[PDB]
From a paper:
SRRPs are attached to the capsular surface via a cell wall anchoring domain and display a long, highly repetitive and glycosylated C-terminal serine rich-repeat (SRR) region. Although the fold topology of the BR domain of PsrP compared to the other BR domains could not be predicted due to very low sequence similarity, the recently determined crystal structure of the KRT10-binding domain of PsrP (BR187–385) revealed a topology distantly related to the CnaA fold.
However, during purification of the heterologously produced BR187–385, higher oligomer states were formed in the final size exclusion chromatography (SEC) step. Interestingly, these isolated oligomer populations were stable in solution but not in steady-state equilibrium with the monomer, as demonstrated using AUC and SEC. Therefore, a shorter construct was designed by deleting the seven C-terminal residues in BR187–385 that were not built in the previously determined crystal structure due to missing electron density. This reciprocal exchange of entire protein segments is termed 3D-domain swapping and has been first described for diphtheria toxin. A common feature of domain-swapped oligomers is the requirement to pass a high-energy barrier between the non-swapped and swapped states. Moreover, intermolecular β-sheets are also observed between symmetry-related domain-swapped dimers with similar interfaces and hydrogen bond patterns.
Author numbering:
A (entry chain A), B (entry chain A): 204 to 379
Amino acid sequence: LNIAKSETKVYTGEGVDSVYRVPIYYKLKVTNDGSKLTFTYTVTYVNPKTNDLGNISSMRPGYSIYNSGTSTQTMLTLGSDLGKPSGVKNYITDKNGRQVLSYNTSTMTTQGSGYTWGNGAQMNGFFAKKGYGLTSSWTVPITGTDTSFTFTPYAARTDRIGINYFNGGGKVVESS
Amino acid sequence: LNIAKSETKVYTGEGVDSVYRVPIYYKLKVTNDGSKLTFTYTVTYVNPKTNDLGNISSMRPGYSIYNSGTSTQTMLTLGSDLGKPSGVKNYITDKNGRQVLSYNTSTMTTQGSGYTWGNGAQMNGFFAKKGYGLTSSWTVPITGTDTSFTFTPYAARTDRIGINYFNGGGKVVESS
Ligand code: NA
Ligand code: NA
């Protein structure tokens, strides 16, 4: 049938460098070959649309930027049929996306998999006033040493589900 | 050696029912038997510490509460060596935690696994002014049909990593 061997989508966007008051841009290229996704992520002061570099003539040579945040600032979230990310290659690319030089490879660390459940049950005042409780239970298989988890309690009246009576206070966090 | 066959921890906390201005409580019991974690989650107006029901005599019998939020309000996050959660049993428990009746079982839906990378590389003004870019790349294996993902771009000066130049605007989201 001569089906495509890969499909690639390119996303761009922009923000503002607060220090020099100029636009800063990102480009995210994602390629799907059927076996794996390949991500290529670039931060630059060159507009991807016009290929023109912004006016940063006053930018000092020692000024430096990161393209990633702290270990707790999630940048990538993956669906259930995507496996474990590889190491992250870091490098400097020229105006045409070609590698100028490369730095040390980074390691992906997970913040964990998040879950919720639908068709939530409810407890009425008739039961509540008897001292009854609304209870949910589930099990989670253990496949190795890292059995860490976090749990966020939730309670809300049925006609205003958005207002959490616990408001984020009593979060349960368990290491290692 | 007669090693314990299981270990259990019980977490409690409290919030406020805005409508009736009374404390509302949660209890989370987590049991580890080596093969799986078992979670038991209860929302109630009975104080777990004193075993005393708050004053909700004015609570109308038709008043109802949920113990969970929307499909996007993450309540449980699991570490890398924890597998896929089972179905969630829903039921009403009495003052002593015994089942009074049960409702329909709920289904856990994942919000995905979150990731970040450390040892982030940096680009200096000398390179930026050449029209160069800071680039990271990685691959992700595909094991099924759901290859959805989200990506949040990030850029910050190296002496103030906390201020994201993209501020959350250009988030990349891909279905199904
Ligand atoms: Na964690
Ligand atoms: Na998703």
